[PDB]
Design a binder for this molecule. Structure first.
Ligand SMILES: CC(=O)N[C@H]1[C@@H](O[C@H]2[C@@H](O)[C@@H](CO)O[C@@H](O)[C@@H]2O[C@@H]2O[C@@H](C)[C@@H](O)[C@@H](O)[C@@H]2O)O[C@H](CO)[C@H](O)[C@@H]1O
Length: 578
């Protein structure tokens, strides 16, 4: 094996930092990105603690669809990245880069990436030590006749140079199954047999109306556990709100795919953290997001979604490495072999661990994510390994009856919760319904009851001297975007915000003059404690929380903690048990 250019694993996770080429400005002789970020400026603005775990991902977006455009733009930016000088130290510190090399089947009518040869990619790897990988994203809807062959070549050229091939794809139209040879195109299967240590496979949750979130994530996890990918992760996309026809938060009615640039701004910020937990809690280590203007920011400035949710989440997964492959393997009780495409796709998990067909969330952590690999792959080398065609998986009820025998019930209440070591992870799983959820969790004899509004997650760690709490319910008010529409009919008919309009809205009304959401209440009740706990190390989003209220009831050895907040929040409670 050629020495790897970087590590990507639980201890060295990866946050991809997208920069999308501005093709309109390219036609005017400029080298710029949509949203006004610059390569150097974006890198400089990444906190120094995150720099070792963050890589700039260039994307060719709307560069002209002709030979040379993407090479020109990419060479220009690789040069900028290579020559970067840290102004504090005066040292040349080449900026790490991933290039988007394949998208939309690389059709010449869809992308400038068509004209990026494997020869050119090899040349770039050899010229730029700071080129750490190449990225393929979103071809499920245009499954080119040579897509598997090209993916093999991308993986091989990456392995040859110590780089990673990273593929973000969703199991629409059997995409993941076909990638590994379902329909007889086996070149990528064979490449992975050799070069899996240089592959990263990610979900891409954009096509939310097709409901393949749970099954794609199941495959990413199973491919990883079975050594068909070095690591896995996910690209979580606020465009899901567009794809599913939602509009104003909690409003009635569906507007369809009619207001895209308003719609990709509307997903609650903290919901991205809820999605990301599904990656982390299942051993995934690679994270990416769209739309970049909302999820990361503009003009080399962090959006509040980035600063209050994504940045803090990513810091958490660096501080608490995700469960290792070995650990996840030990914990896996059932591993599915076969094609979700033959068993209802995402419907497979509805009312097993998802609450509806179109959601990126889970309603229980009891089974965590059940890992699977497509039927084309083998289970010889790879726990009960079960064919997807088994009677145990024939119906919703059968699945639960079987899984429940192997995965015991470990909490109470209609809420998402999952436990790792001494940590309960909890979130309200409602997507667009304004409904509180409650759960009862235990740390041995200590009882913790929680009440969460939608778009709220928490991490509760039993430490020797009490409990460490991380809470995030950050959700700004997007109603301005939907003003002048009292119903779905009117909302569908609003003037288009447009891409440029949405970027400008972020600049003028999100980066500044933000319409923050209202503070809202979280309740935490601890039963079985000796004395009034003390609170320590309280911090969170500025101006976003009231001082927590602790009400201790001596007779019943319990405390009720009431929090009123809208943001990220951390604190410790110190106490002993009774
Ligand atoms: C047409 C358009 O608005 N393009 C911008 C938009 O692109 C994404 C959306 O159109 C989304 C709707 O669900 O569909 C996605 O396919 C699309 O993603 C882009 O194209 C695909 C083929 C891939 O190349 C993706 O990597 C790419 O983002 O939003 C993105 C930013 O999220 C860009 O501004 C597009 O210009």
């Amino acid at each position: 094996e050629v020495d790897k250019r970087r590590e990507i694993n639980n201890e060295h996770p990866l946050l991809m930092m997208p920069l999308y080429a501005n093709g309109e400005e390219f036609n005017q002789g400029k080298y710029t990105f949509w949203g006004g970020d610059t390569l150097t400026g974006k890198w400089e603005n990444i906190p120094d603690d995150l720099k070792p775990y963050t890589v700039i991902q260039l994307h060719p977006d709307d560069l002209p669809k002709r030979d040379g455009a993407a090479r020109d733009f990419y060479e220009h930016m690789l040069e900028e990245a290579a020559k970067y000088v840290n102004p504090k130290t005066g040292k040349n510190e080449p900026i790490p880069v991933i290039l988007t090399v394949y998208t939309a089947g690389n059709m010449p009518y869809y992308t400038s990436a068509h004209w990026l040869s494997t020869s050119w990619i090899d040349k770039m790897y050899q010229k730029y030590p700071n080129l750490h990988g190449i990225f393929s994203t979103e071809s499920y809807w245009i499954w080119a006749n040579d897509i598997e062959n090209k993916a093999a070549d991308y993986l091989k050229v990456s392995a040859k140079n110590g780089g990673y091939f990273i593929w973000a794809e969703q199991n629409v139209g059997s995409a993941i199954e076909k990638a590994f040879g379902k329909n007889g195109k086996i070149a990528f299967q064979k490449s992975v047999d050799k070069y899996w240590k240089n592959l990263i496979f990610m979900f891409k949750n954009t096509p939310a109306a097709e409901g393949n979130d749970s099954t794609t994530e199941s495959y990413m996890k199973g491919l990883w556990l079975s050594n068909h990918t070095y690591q896995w992760g996910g690209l979580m996309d606020t465009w899901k709100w567009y794809e599913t026809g939602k509009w104003k938060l909690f409003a009635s009615g569906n507007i369809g795919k009619s207001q895209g640039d308003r719609q990709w701004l509307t997903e609650p910020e903290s919901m991205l953290g809820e999605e990301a937990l599904g990656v982390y809690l299942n051993g995934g280590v690679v994270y990416n997001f769209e739309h970049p203007a909302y999820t990361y920011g503009v003009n080399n400035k962090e959006s509040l979604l980035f600063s209050e949710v994504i940045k803090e989440f990513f810091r958490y997964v660096i501080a608490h490495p995700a469960p290792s492959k070995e650990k996840v393997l030990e914990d896996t009780k059932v591993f599915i072999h076969g094609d979700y495409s033959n068993k209802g796709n995402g419907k497979f998990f509805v009312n097993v661990n998802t609450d509806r067909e179109q959601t990126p969330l889970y309603m229980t952590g009891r089974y965590n994510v059940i890992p699977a690999i497509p039927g084309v792959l083998k289970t010889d080398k790879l726990i009960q390994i079960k064919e997807i065609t088994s009677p145990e998986f024939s119906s919703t009820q059968a699945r639960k009856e079987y899984l429940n025998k192997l995965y015991p019930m470990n909490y109470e209440g209609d809420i998402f919760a999952q436990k790792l070591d001494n940590r309960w992870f909890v979130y309200n799983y409602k997507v667009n319904e304004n409904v509180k959820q409650t759960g009862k969790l235990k740390f041995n004899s200590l009882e913790m009851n929680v009440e969460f509004e939608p778009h709220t997650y928490g991490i509760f760690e039993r430490i020797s001297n009490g409990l460490k709490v991380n809470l995030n319910n950050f959700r700004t008010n997007k109603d301005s975007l939907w003003s002048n529409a009292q119903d779905a009919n009117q909302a569908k008919k609003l003037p288009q915000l447009t891409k440029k309009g949405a970027i400008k809205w972020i600049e003028e009304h999100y980066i500044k003059d933000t319409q923050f959401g209202e503070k809202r209440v979280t309740k935490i009740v601890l039963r079985g404690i000796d004395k009034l706990p003390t609170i320590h190390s309280l911090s969170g989003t500025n101006n976003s929380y009231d001082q927590p209220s602790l009400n201790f009831d001596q007779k019943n050895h319990m405390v009720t903690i009431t929090i009123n907040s809208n943001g990220n929040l951390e604190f410790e409670l110190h106490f002993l048990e009774h």
